[PDB]
């Protein structure tokens, strides 16, 4: 009977991710005023979250619940490619925003000139194309397949992610580690700018910045690091990891996409659009 209870919670998570990203995507397209240079990027995050919540999680929920992959061998490999592209796109997009906010604050008087509608599409397309070198290329060359559970790749009943030592390190570095270093570095410099500006205000007059800056970095770090710290150590030390442990951290990471719109919201423009939508 415990299996029935777990299904309700998993079903709600899939529903929550679908509605949350849809509203953000709908608001940007429906209203021209909300559509801006910075808001063009969040459409990509909304698009990345939308496909992840509908074409990755729902199939993954069936895999755990039914304890078997009813679909064909090729489609399971296809699902893995879609599963990794969405995570790579979502994490990279958050890193792109970190670059966007860093340029606006640290180097003003050039943000209007550097960023443009034509320029916004180029970098967004580059981010998505970057996922192609991380998702499409492995399956085409079948390099994702591992010798433990060698028959798992062959058998169509159940398939598990068994990756070579090279890909596990390289993909984790590209998807999460490299965006992490960029995101932390620019946000630290942004915090210095806020501290300097606040100090200047107190100089000629008679912090809350950390609280709001913590949410953006904290949610990204809390919801992905436990998985990616384990996504690099299971391959080097096979005996250390447990099979159920790996899955539990993976689904924690999927919740970040569902909670992503909440972090990047509460602005006056989106609050108006929420009332207009409902």
């Amino acid at each position: 009977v415990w299996v029935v209870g777990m299904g309700i919670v998993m079903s709600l998570i899939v529903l929550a991710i679908v509605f949350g990203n849809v509203l953000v995507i709908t608001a940007i397209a429906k209203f021209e005023r909300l559509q801006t240079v910075t808001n063009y990027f969040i459409t990509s995050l909304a698009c990345a979250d939308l496909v992840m919540g509908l074409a990755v999680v729902p199939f993954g929920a069936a895999h755990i619940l039914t304890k078997t992959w009813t679909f064909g061998n090729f489609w399971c490999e296809f699902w893995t490619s879609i599963d990794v592209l969405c995570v790579t796109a979502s994490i990279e997009t958050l890193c792109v925003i970190a670059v966007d906010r860093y340029f606006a604050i640290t180097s003003p008087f050039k943000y209007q000139s550097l960023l443009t509608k034509n320029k916004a599409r180029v970098i967004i397309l580059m981010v998505w194309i970057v996922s192609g070198l991380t998702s499409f290329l492995p399956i085409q060359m079948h390099w994702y397949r591992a010798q433990e559970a060698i028959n798992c790749y062959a058998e169509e009943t159940c398939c598990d992610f068994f990756t070579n030592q090279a890909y596990a390190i390289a993909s984790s570095i590209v998807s999460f580690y490299v965006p992490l270093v960029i995101m932390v570095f620019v946000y630290s410099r942004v915090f210095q700018e806020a501290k300097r500006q606040l100090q200047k205000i107190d100089k000629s007059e008679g912090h809350k910045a950390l609280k709001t800056l913590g949410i953006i970095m904290g949610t990204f770090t809390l919801c992905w690091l436990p998985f990616f710290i384990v996504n690099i150590v299971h391959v080097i030390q096979d005996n250390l990891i447990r099979k159920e442990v790996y899955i539990l951290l993976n689904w924690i990471g999927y919740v970040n996409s569902g909670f992503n719109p909440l972090i990047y919201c509460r602005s006056p423009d989106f609050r108006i659009a929420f009332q207009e939508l409902l």
């Binding site: 003003p108 000629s204 509460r266 602005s267």
Partner: protein, 301 residues
Amino acid sequence: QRNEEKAQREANKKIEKQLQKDKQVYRATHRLLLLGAGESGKSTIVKQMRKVQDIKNNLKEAIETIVAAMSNLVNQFRVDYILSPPEFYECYERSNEYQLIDCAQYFLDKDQDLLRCRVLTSGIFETKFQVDKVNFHMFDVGDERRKWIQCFNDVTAIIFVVASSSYNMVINRLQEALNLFKSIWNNRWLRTISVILFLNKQDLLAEKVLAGKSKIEDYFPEFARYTTPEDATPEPEDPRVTRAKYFIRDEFLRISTASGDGRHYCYPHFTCAVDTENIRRVFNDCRDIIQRMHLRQYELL
């Protein structure tokens, strides 16, 4: 027929292409508005930030205007000849109460003459200059209603020049200038526009302050109660005028900060006619305008 509709598309493409090129230029350029009274000497800042015979003729006429006004406000043939030329060419103590050009006294007593005395213009004077940053364009209104202010909503900052020394010119002029500052601050349309104000004639401020003939306490009773702030004050100046210097700033500052929080800041700068660094001061303050505007965006502040 259908070719004309296709032809109209080609003409539309040229217009869209031409507008697209100017979109980057317009976005790069920054707009400022200069506000100041007649005696505020706003022309000095514009000239400092950025012929002689023509200026001399107006200056000579300006001397006659003060001379004629002084007689009416209180060698008659000589006075009549000037009021009505080499013959015409051949007061200041009471000039505070009367209305006169600031540089008229220097001209009357008598190469930086153009900077000291400049002919004003009724029309809007647009000043464009570059400080190695994005393009800067300064606009001057050039009336009691002041309805053109509501038209200005895209300017990054507003320059509000104040003649600090002109506190004894009761018609007090400074309180009148302060009164206009409250109206622009409490304007229902100037929500996201800051102000950069210059307390001009600081050197002239000390001279009036140093001399005990005019007491700031007479115009402002609270000045005696007001004490100098503990914050650092540049000196080279006596503390007697230094306390006076901060009081006029505090009066402007108290109204500016109390009314609104966020996207409404004032950047008081003490300035002098000789000083030419004011161009860099605006750029340093203009940079703070965009940052604080962006800090409030995304609720990062």
